[PDB]
Amino acid sequence: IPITVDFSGGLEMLFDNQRRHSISLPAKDTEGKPVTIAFLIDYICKKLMKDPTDLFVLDNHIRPGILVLINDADWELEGEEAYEIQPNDNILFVSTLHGG
Amino acid sequence: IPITVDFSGGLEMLFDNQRRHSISLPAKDTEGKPVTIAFLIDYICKKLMKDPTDLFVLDNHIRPGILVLINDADWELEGEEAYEIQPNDNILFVSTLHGG
Amino acid sequence: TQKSLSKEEIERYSRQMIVPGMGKEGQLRLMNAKVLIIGAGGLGCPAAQYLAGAGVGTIGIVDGDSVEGMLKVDSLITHLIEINPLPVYVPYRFDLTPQNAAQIIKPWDVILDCTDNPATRYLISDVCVLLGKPLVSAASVQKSGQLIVLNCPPTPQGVVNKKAAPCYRCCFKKPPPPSAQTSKGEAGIMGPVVGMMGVAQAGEAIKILVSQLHMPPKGEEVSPEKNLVQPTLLIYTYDLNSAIGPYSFRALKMGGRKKDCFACGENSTLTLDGIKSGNPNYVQQ
Amino acid sequence: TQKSLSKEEIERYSRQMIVPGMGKEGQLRLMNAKVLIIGAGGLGCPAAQYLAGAGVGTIGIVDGDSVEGMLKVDSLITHLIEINPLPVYVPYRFDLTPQNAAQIIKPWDVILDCTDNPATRYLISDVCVLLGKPLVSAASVQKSGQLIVLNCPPTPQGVVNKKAAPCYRCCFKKPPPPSAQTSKGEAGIMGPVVGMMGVAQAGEAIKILVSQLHMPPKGEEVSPEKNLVQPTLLIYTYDLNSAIGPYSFRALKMGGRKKDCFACGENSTLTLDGIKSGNPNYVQQ
Ligand SMILES: [Zn+2]
Ligand SMILES: [Zn+2]
């Protein structure tokens, strides 16, 4: 499955000033069943990262800070970290801003 | 062909404060060949209008003022008023702003 | 209450009086309006500037911080009179806390949030919700900014039975992250970002008042072309290595009140008496 | 030329000095920078405010109009010192014309357009093109506004052989419409619209200077992630009967120099000597 992944809200700083990310995924996960978004978090944080982990994912889960959107749709109703990724989906990782 | 048509830049005022417009078209024009965007101008100005003609189209052609975009693409390279409309195309009519 | 317009006022407002939606009728809305801004630095200034200019009846401001001696509230108000002498500016020359925040809001028709501290940001929504007031919240740090319009129109606490505007908790459920928090003092700020966001904040507030969007609807549902009950969270990223990009303004439509929200949802253990006492202690850090 | 930073300056700019892209290195760019604003009302004010604040070296302003006795140039400059004492503000206390416009631009590094008259808007691009200067143009009337970044980096007149930034004529080819023209005096103006647009204008200008985007590229092509040669035309519509909508900010990518453009294209009959004489008489009305 080839998808486009985006960052914003002072997150992309982690990924070397890059917001737009296109990488094709394996259709099947490690245990042979279809890619979930538990996968994308693991793949991204381990390989796509360009910085020290604390700021994106901690204790085997995303930091409460960030929101995830699938085709600009709430991640929680559509699968909530166990979502069979689609062949051209868009996933957005935005760190909620609490300064002003 | 069912398409969505939009207005902006102090044009939609003409169409009763409405920007988003969905109306399905006949696939074939009056003379049986496929719908062009010469058609949409004629259909819109005659039926969809809610105001007095001078401001949108004059002398059987759009006012030099306005730009037309097809899927947010310049109208001029893609057909320029003689464009076979597509089954889900988006056409945008924006009056160029010369005040500040 | 004022029913008529001064030659003084008619002269000042004529430029925006002659626009669709903003008659003698639409303008008087703003003149009798009472808006509050929580936070005087950064987003406060431009927000306040464009309310003042618009001739918002009364404009409140809340900040105990001083300039970089002289409180920033006072500095700013002094500024605003220059823009528009006619409005009544009301300085809360201290910092908001649970003990008072209840007191500081009950008067005002529309609440703007510019507070810059996460704990405070949650506090306001809670109160705003309970007291039944619409919040235009907005945030800015470093190169990025974002804005949203919550609890408009203001739907009572726990009324989940009707399509109902989301609270700040409903949105942004439990985070703030404890060590992922950067401040404007900590991480800096480009000017145009905080500027865009403030000006927009005023924008949303003015809209709410002029078109009367804080007014509950007729058993009829609320039009979704207002984007009130399902409101966009506009995210502005400022890239100083690029021109305006298609992905400069991204608009993330948001969900109506989360039926299970701690605060505005069904079976909330949140009371105005509570926050006063230190009840949901804002130790989330 | 200035190589070092005053404790005075270091104190004022520290808030935006500590942001990615804006070091002692990035800040000095702005301090040696020379920006010009054509038009002092409406878009002028906020544009100027956010350049001033940013500490743009020299800030020019051009408007012969008075307030509603005292020229609006003077009024505004008086305002700006309050925001930032350090910049050199330079008032052209008259109105721009073909006879001078050549003279009024040749000094300045970046040109902002806030002129509010269509004829003038075309004039500037022409000159800006010929003299070889980048234009951040912006417009606002009533409930709607829009912005674009032309001729950045500045590609010489007629050089069609290379991927090259579009002029105002290249974009907006022959229109202005004669009887479809509304002025800001004619049709009014909501505050947040002109505010958003001005602040953004400053935004684009600052960017150009800080990241050095007016600098021609290395036979190498220009990165398209700058959105300079193929720049977005951001259209802001302000709906005071709705909240921020997904279709609030629409970003229309634009074409590089039209090879057949009257002015910046191949076989242009446009000369700096020409405009002076009244050559392309701005009678398009
Ligand atoms: Zn809630
Ligand atoms: Zn050209």
UniProtKB/TrEMBL annotation, chains C, D:
User: What is catalysed by this protein?
Assistant: [molybdopterin-synthase sulfur-carrier protein]-C-terminal Gly-Gly + ATP + H(+) = [molybdopterin-synthase sulfur-carrier protein]-C-terminal Gly-Gly-AMP + diphosphate; [molybdopterin-synthase sulfur-carrier protein]-C-terminal Gly-Gly-AMP + S-sulfanyl-L-cysteinyl-[cysteine desulfurase] + AH2 = [molybdopterin-synthase sulfur-carrier protein]-C-terminal-Gly-aminoethanethioate + L-cysteinyl-[cysteine desulfurase] + A + AMP + 2 H(+)
Give the GO terms filed under biological process for this record.
Answer: Mo-molybdopterin cofactor biosynthetic process; protein urmylation; tRNA wobble position uridine thiolation
Disulfide pattern: 170-264
Keyword check for Nucleotidyltransferase, yes or no.
yes
Look up the EC number in the record and give it.
2.7.7.80, 2.8.1.11
Q: In which pathway does it act?
A: Cofactor biosynthesis; molybdopterin biosynthesis; tRNA modification; 5-methoxycarbonylmethyl-2-thiouridine-tRNA biosynthesis
Signal peptide range in chain numbering: none
Which residues are listed for Zn(2+) binding in this entry? 167, 170, 261, 264
Annotated active site residues, numbered on this chain, are 184 (glycyl thioester intermediate)
Cofactor binding remark? Binds 1 zinc ion per subunit.
* Cell location: Cytoplasm, Cytosol
Cofactor dependency: Zn(2+)
At the top level of its lineage, which domain of life is listed?
A: Eukaryota
Residues reported to bind ATP: 42, 63, 72, 116-117
Keyword annotations for this protein, in alphabetical order, are: ATP-binding, Cytoplasm, Metal-binding, Molybdenum cofactor biosynthesis, Multifunctional enzyme, Nucleotide-binding, Nucleotidyltransferase, Transferase, tRNA processing, Ubl conjugation pathway, Zinc
Task: Give any GO molecular function from the UniProt entry.
Answer: metal ion binding
Q: Name one GO cellular component term.
A: cytosol
Instruction: Quote the function comment for this protein.
Output: Plays a central role in 2-thiolation of mcm(5)S(2)U at tRNA wobble positions of cytosolic tRNA(Lys), tRNA(Glu) and tRNA(Gln). Also essential during biosynthesis of the molybdenum cofactor. Acts by mediating the C-terminal thiocarboxylation of sulfur carriers urm1 and MOCS2A. Its N-terminus first activates urm1 and MOCS2A as acyl-adenylates (-COAMP), then the persulfide sulfur on the catalytic cysteine is transferred to urm1 and MOCS2A to form thiocarboxylation (-COSH) of their C-terminus.
Record family assignment:
In the N-terminal section; belongs to the HesA/MoeB/ThiF family. UBA4 subfamily.
By what name is this protein known? Adenylyltransferase and sulfurtransferase uba4
Give the species this sequence originates from.
Chaetomium thermophilum (strain DSM 1495 / CBS 144.50 / IMI 039719) (Thermochaetoides thermophila)
Gene name, Swiss-Prot/TrEMBL: uba4
Range within the parent protein: 4 to 303 of 444
